[PDB]
Point group: D2
Chain length 354, copies 4
Amino acid sequence: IENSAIALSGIVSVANNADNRLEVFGVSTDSAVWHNWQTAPLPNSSWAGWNKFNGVVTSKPAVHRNSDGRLEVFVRGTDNALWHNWQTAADTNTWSSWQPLYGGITSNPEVCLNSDGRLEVFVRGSDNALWHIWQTAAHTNSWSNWKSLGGTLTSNPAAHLNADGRIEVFARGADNALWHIWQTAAHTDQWSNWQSLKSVITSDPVVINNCDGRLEVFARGADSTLRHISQIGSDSVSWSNWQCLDGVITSAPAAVKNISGQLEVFARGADNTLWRTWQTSHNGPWSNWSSFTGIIASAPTVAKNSDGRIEVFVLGLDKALWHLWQTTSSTTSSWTTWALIGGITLIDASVILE
Amino acid sequence: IENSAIALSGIVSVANNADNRLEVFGVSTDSAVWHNWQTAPLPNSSWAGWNKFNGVVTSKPAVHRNSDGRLEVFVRGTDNALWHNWQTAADTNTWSSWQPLYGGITSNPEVCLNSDGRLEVFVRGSDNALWHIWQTAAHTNSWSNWKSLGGTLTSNPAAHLNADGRIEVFARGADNALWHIWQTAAHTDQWSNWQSLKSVITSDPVVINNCDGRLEVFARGADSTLRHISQIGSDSVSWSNWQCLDGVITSAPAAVKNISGQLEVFARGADNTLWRTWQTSHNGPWSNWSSFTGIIASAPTVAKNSDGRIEVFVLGLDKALWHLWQTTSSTTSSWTTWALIGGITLIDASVILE
Amino acid sequence: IENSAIALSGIVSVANNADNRLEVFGVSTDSAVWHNWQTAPLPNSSWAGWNKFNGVVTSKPAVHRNSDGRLEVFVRGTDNALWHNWQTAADTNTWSSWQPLYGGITSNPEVCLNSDGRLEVFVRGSDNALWHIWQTAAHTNSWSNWKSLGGTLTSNPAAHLNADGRIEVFARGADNALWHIWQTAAHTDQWSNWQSLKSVITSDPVVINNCDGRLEVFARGADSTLRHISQIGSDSVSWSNWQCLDGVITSAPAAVKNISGQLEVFARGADNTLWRTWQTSHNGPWSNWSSFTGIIASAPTVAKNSDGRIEVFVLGLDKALWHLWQTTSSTTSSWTTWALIGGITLIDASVILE
Amino acid sequence: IENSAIALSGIVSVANNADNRLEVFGVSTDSAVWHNWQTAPLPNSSWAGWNKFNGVVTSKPAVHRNSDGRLEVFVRGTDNALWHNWQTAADTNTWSSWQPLYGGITSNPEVCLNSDGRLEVFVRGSDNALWHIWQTAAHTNSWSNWKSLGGTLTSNPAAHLNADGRIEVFARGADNALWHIWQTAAHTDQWSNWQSLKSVITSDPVVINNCDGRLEVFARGADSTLRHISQIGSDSVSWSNWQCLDGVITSAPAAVKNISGQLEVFARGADNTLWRTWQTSHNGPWSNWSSFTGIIASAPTVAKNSDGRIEVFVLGLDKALWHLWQTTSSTTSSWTTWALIGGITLIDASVILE
Ligand SMILES: C[C@@H]1O[C@@H](O)[C@@H](O)[C@H](O)[C@@H]1O
Ligand SMILES: C[C@@H]1O[C@@H](O)[C@@H](O)[C@H](O)[C@@H]1O
Ligand SMILES: C[C@@H]1O[C@@H](O)[C@@H](O)[C@H](O)[C@@H]1O
Ligand SMILES: C[C@@H]1O[C@@H](O)[C@@H](O)[C@H](O)[C@@H]1O
Ligand SMILES: C[C@@H]1O[C@H](O)[C@@H](O)[C@H](O)[C@@H]1O
Ligand SMILES: C[C@@H]1O[C@H](O)[C@@H](O)[C@H](O)[C@@H]1O
Ligand SMILES: C[C@@H]1O[C@H](O)[C@@H](O)[C@H](O)[C@@H]1O
Ligand SMILES: C[C@@H]1O[C@H](O)[C@@H](O)[C@H](O)[C@@H]1O
Ligand SMILES: C[C@@H]1O[C@H](O)[C@@H](O)[C@H](O)[C@@H]1O
Ligand SMILES: C[C@@H]1O[C@H](O)[C@@H](O)[C@H](O)[C@@H]1O
Ligand SMILES: C[C@@H]1O[C@H](O)[C@@H](O)[C@H](O)[C@@H]1O
Ligand SMILES: C[C@@H]1O[C@H](O)[C@@H](O)[C@H](O)[C@@H]1O
Ligand SMILES: C[C@@H]1O[C@H](O)[C@@H](O)[C@H](O)[C@@H]1O
Ligand SMILES: C[C@@H]1O[C@H](O)[C@@H](O)[C@H](O)[C@@H]1O
Ligand SMILES: C[C@@H]1O[C@H](O)[C@@H](O)[C@H](O)[C@@H]1O
Ligand SMILES: C[C@@H]1O[C@H](O)[C@@H](O)[C@H](O)[C@@H]1O
């Protein structure tokens, strides 16, 4: 692979509803967003069926739960501006129409919740810089003007809250290295300069928080293996060295923290099946990758159920959405085999960044 | 102290709003509930002033945030039944009137959020058993009938979610030991039998979750010192031995998990000042207690701000509410000295359990 | 029990030979020291039989392995002075006669190895202060003069190396609290002043090193339960608060670090059987005590075999030495039941400190 | 670099004497072994000066301390057989002549101490298999016959005790992967078959024990960076995945466990200076490499002083031995700059394995 490659992304965005039911969002062959959901937060739950939002879209959709429980989806439109829609009541299938947030968008949108309850969206803009826009009041349809954070992006952005409430954004730069920028006071429009974490990544970065409040970042490297880095913590503003893990992966990775507090990472492997690795102990070494039966056609998208059970979604060879999950909450739970969520097929609507 | 004593409780209940502003609830000399809140989730924020809910009450009030962000308060009424009121919109000072949930209540109420978004309330009933009632749909004013969990309670109940979504309830029993009972499937009406954790406690139990998903319980013991016990974990249904910490305490303890993942405990000490102890490392030993200047007249009530800063509320010698807090998010942050939240005085409305 | 009680001690001293065979030393009804050893460092090993050192003694004997592998035993004599004898070659049953080190001794002797290979002995002296004497060259029969470290002791001393090579000595003081004093430079005659760790202990203190280089001290408390305290570490000269563990114990405790790095403690329990508790995780909480069948008449003495298997020695109701051990090296190994090491009976020769 | 390269090795072997004084062994331009030692185990200690053992040698020498404190050195002779010499008394400069152990040796020798006090030596033999020979009685000049462990070696062997007393040997195989073989009962002639840890290493393997009893192995990889792997533990016979650390290294690595229980690794870096990395927390992530001033001409050899202070030895550009060390025992201690141990120059006598 080339240093400037971006690994295959996930095919849906997933969220937990206010009642913790999983709900997924993808783009079908009509270039419209469709969604589907569990009807109950139970291990046996049926799924409602695929329901369409009217409107042609031009990016992967991004979803986040508002601080009042209402889901809200962000997507690029036919006019290359940002659009969004939302549940008008938590846990209810009453949605707004797509509504305009304007701007000129050249990446998939990335949405984060500030620690004061206000949603905030990050995109690459028409000048390849990072731009953002936010709710000016928690869970309200009052949005700011667009504002630039500068930089030159060559990946989609990835945003995450630090334990102290400061949003931090990660993105690949013009030199194919991982760069990052952050709020310097929680949920305030006060930002750092861009700083480089070095190395070379060949996927979007993926970021998760450890129990102990340290951010950890995962990405595919130049040699096509998983690599990761973490904050040193203790009021330090330093990071660890990079480590790679053996095993060639062929999609973006997806990270999750299990209910035991340990990290797990999923990715499509060299044989195009789903691979999983997990920390064997607190901060510990990582297990050899383990494989699930079945060839997959997207990166995994990983979520957790109301009872902590991990669930994974992927594009199948039939171009439909499949999922599998842990049967019980235990960290040693067995897993199901891939099952179909049928009724539509999906396309990869991700913005082509080059 | 006698084995059957119940240590002095906190004087307010505290919650985070959907936007993470702190809001406190207490009972004034008119035997009505009043509340006060931060106007913004900032370290410098002013407080709105004391506002009254009309209605005479006969217990300490209990507050919880619904899964749609709306706060909801539970209290015993003049008729010894359960009453509740709620914000009609998240982050808004538009409240319902007190509305009836009926029942015969002989303890302070305790409220928990199930992992499927439904509030659930636990009380001691007219026959001294544990009784509960719940929302039948997430964040909706549809409630179940009252149902008995049996037992004989001599403390208020304390409820907490396990990492796998199962509510677990702790309460002192007829033998003055700590007992507990739990959902055996997450957010389902399937409960265990009562089981004893043994020992003798002289306060309500206080329960918190560790990073690694293990519950930890704190209480004052027969010798008036803090003692604690924790789940062994690893799909075990066993608990650790009890450990006590040196230092005589004179109120209920209050536990909090800081943004570094470590536990801290606050309690009024033998000299009637606020004492604090913290885990020195991951699961580690506990620090010697450290003292804050100022004589206090209630147990502490502890909360965290939107940026992770710990904040403590207590009754003063003037019978008014005071608070102090960490000045920065760091675990080594300095602390302020007690400041007054003036305008009313408070009484301890806790139900007298004997 | 009274605050000034000293819990029943172990009946033998145990050491590993240069080849790691266990060897035990006790006092028989002739008031002479006898010893016995494994003939091979194997799980099935026979024991050689009881062999007598000629000479009447007046304390429990203390044994340590020199830095050249030779065992060396220290004891108080009929003249109340210190005497010692030694293997003249490692792993060989060729011993010196008892040889004089003089002094006036009013406690059992305690021996430690400095980090530069020189043995050092600590005793309470005729004026109740701590006194010490040392090899002036590693593993050589050249000893210093007696020198005083001051203080007032009401227990036998317990000495242990810090991770940085500094000997630290623990002993109960005139106020029945735990006190300690330490080298301020490794293996040098430069010592701190006495400092109090506070509390009240009713046994000799027992000290062990954690993996992470922090000393941890165990003792019985005023309420007859096990209590413990540890160094905070990180170049701090502070200690944790004291914690007690539920369960009444009736002898001195014995601590050991298993080959997994976790601490375990053994003690005679309230029912006069052997009890065991272990840390359930890294620095973690402690297990409920578990009991071994059989009434015992001394504190346990605990050792580790060449393969890490834990082995325990106690006085039986027949006044003979019994032992049991782990059958395999695993931390979850099963245990044998008490077996007799027959041929002599033993007395408790410990110096009566009052 | 090629997959079959073996990274530059250290220029001396180092041991602690019975009194913990450091002593180093190297080969000079006369192809004889010389040694030098600290005169006292102190931070300021002078060194004795270079002293020659008569006899021409044909490998790097290997040194180990016997279980009776006497150092013993192993080397290949002019006849390609194994030779050894020893201190005849601990801590004394009275040495045997080189004495024969015979055999046909095609690697540097590697020496380990069994958990029953018997030295054991591992070499590649005339048929490229692993061969070994051992003391049949602890610290005695009675040796076994040579015996084969099979395999095909392309690196020098590296041997280490498991926490349970079983020797484990690591060596690169015919496929350039890391292989290992182990005693299946502690200090017994009962061995496993060879098993592969996979990957590709371009240096000798280096093995150390973690506090928690798990072996960890370090080696340079095919991409010239440091990589490492560890035992999973918990009576499992599994290992972690491999991880690499960013940073090109140009010698064998040297690992050490500091007195805080954390691992540190030293290696010559891409700019031919000494680099150091350390675990930032328990099992934690690894720091970015830090550099010491000065170009070096060998891998580092790392030791610990009697007080825990880390000390490093390297070949200088003048072909003499240099060292630097921590000034205090603290983990954050400052370091000295390179100082000369003058009087001879050294050559790399390592056996050329191809
Ligand atoms: C995001 C970063 O912004 C500037 O610093 C560029 O010079 C970097 O190459 C990178 O694109
Ligand atoms: C809550 C518990 O319920 C029953 O088991 C009683 O026998 C106990 O004493 C306790 O009150
Ligand atoms: C060992 C200690 O030495 C002195 O400080 C005494 O005052 C203490 O009581 C204690 O005995
Ligand atoms: C040491 C190992 O021994 C055999 O298994 C060989 O097939 C391997 O290639 C390796 O050399
Ligand atoms: C998502 C939105 O759907 C609408 O129908 C379009 O008119 C907008 O341009 C945008 O594409
Ligand atoms: C997303 C932002 O929208 C604005 O309208 C543009 O002017 C900016 O360059 C950027 O593209
Ligand atoms: C995940 C499923 O595995 C099967 O082998 C495929 O045939 C399906 O299309 C799908 O990819
Ligand atoms: C809290 C409620 O306030 C109301 O005014 C009363 O009528 C009810 O009895 C109850 O006390
Ligand atoms: C709280 C419950 O209310 C019901 O009405 C009573 O019948 C129960 O005994 C219990 O007190
Ligand atoms: C906390 C405050 O400390 C002061 O000393 C008291 O005078 C106030 O009443 C209040 O208790
Ligand atoms: C241990 C020593 O044994 C000898 O026989 C005695 O003479 C000494 O006094 C001392 O008791
Ligand atoms: C052990 C020491 O021996 C010396 O001879 C005595 O003078 C001291 O007081 C002390 O007893
Ligand atoms: C440990 C052994 O247990 C048995 O019950 C006793 O009869 C023996 O004397 C001995 O104490
Ligand atoms: C190390 C030994 O030194 C001796 O002098 C030689 O005779 C042997 O062959 C061997 O080299
Ligand atoms: C080291 C061993 O020495 C023996 O003499 C040889 O026969 C073996 O092949 C091997 O080289
Ligand atoms: C370590 C020392 O650093 C210096 O720069 C060199 O000149 C010396 O030869 C030696 O290598």
